[PDB]
């Protein structure tokens, strides 16, 4: 029975339990630096010391991708297909230090079915497209026939968040383009684009308002909805997690869907309170 096969995510991409208890999935970490403290973005690292950590801190949080080397020793297993899911290449090295790593690995131990997915998102985004590789692996694909679909699936999943603090992602050059001070109470309501970079929106004033628009943005752009998997991050909010499930049941059904922790990765860009929805 061949289910020779492994998927590989950076560190933003939370695993569920399930996911953690089923072996298949592999994680490489990325790096967190925050004054003299660099950290490694994995299991041993506790939501609640980095939150600390960052509130305490002056400075911005910096993070660095997974280096190839990394990648390239993922890859070198006995599973025949390899299926690597990253951040959005507009966000992060991550993506193109995957790729380079399969250069380096073909060069090293020759031909091998390695594909890196770009995500074009962040968090469960990624976690979403784990899951639809395993998914089509459990369907009998060919492993062309899974790069076929989860490339689709990709293209037809939209990411969107609210956070209270969108400075980490502002000081760190991924809000670029878009612009700045009314309402000291104004929450965006934010996304991606189909290029995997972000845009706002919406907004609106206070959290419990932009958590209705935000529902309303998902529900705008949501086609066949019972056909996917809806899924929630949060930081440090998992009350204001359960509101939002709450508020896009009234809005369409899906599959099923399913709450989240944030990563590391996904702590230091969002900020304690953040919420990130991926269909
Ligand atoms: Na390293
Ligand atoms: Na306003
Ligand atoms: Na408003």
């Not at 076929?148 to 037809?156: A, K, L, T």
Request: glycine share 6%.
């Amino acid at each position: 029975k061949d289910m020779s096969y492994k998927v590989i995510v950076d560190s933003c991409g939370e695993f569920t339990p399930e996911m953690k208890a089923d072996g298949g999935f592999e994680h490489v970490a990325l790096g967190i630096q925050i004054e003299d403290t660099q950290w490694t973005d994995d299991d041993s690292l506790k939501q609640e010391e980095l939150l600390l950590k960052i509130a305490e801190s002056t400075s911005c949080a910096k993070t660095s991708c997974p280096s190839p080397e990394r990648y390239m020793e993922s890859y070198h297993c006995d599973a025949e297909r390899i299926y690597v899911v990253t951040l959005s290449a507009e966000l992060s090295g991550s993506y193109n230090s995957a790729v380079l790593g399969k250069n380096l690995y073909e060069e090293e131990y020759g031909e091998k079915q390695i594909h890196v997915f770009n995500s074009r998102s962040a968090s469960v985004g990624e976690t979403l497209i784990a899951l639809k590789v395993q998914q089509c692996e459990k369907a009998g694909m060919t492993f062309e026939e899974v790069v076929e679909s989860v490339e689709c699936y990709i293209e037809e999943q939209h990411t969107y968040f609210v956070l209270e603090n969108l400075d980490t992602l502002r000081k760190n050059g991924r809000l670029t383009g878009i612009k700045s001070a009314g309402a000291l109470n104004i929450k965006p309501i934010m996304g991606s684009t189909p290029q995997g970079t972000i845009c706002q929106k919406e907004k609106a004033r206070g959290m419990k308002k932009a958590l209705v628009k935000m529902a309303d943005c998902v529900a705008a752009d949501v086609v066949n909805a019972g056909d996917k998997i809806l899924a929630i991050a949060h930081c440090n909010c998992e009350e204001r997690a359960k509101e939002v499930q709450r508020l896009l049941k009234e809005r369409f059904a899906v599959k099923s869907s399913f709450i989240v922790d944030t990563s590391g990765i996904s702590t230091v860009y969002a900020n304690d309170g953040g919420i990130i929805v991926v269909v």
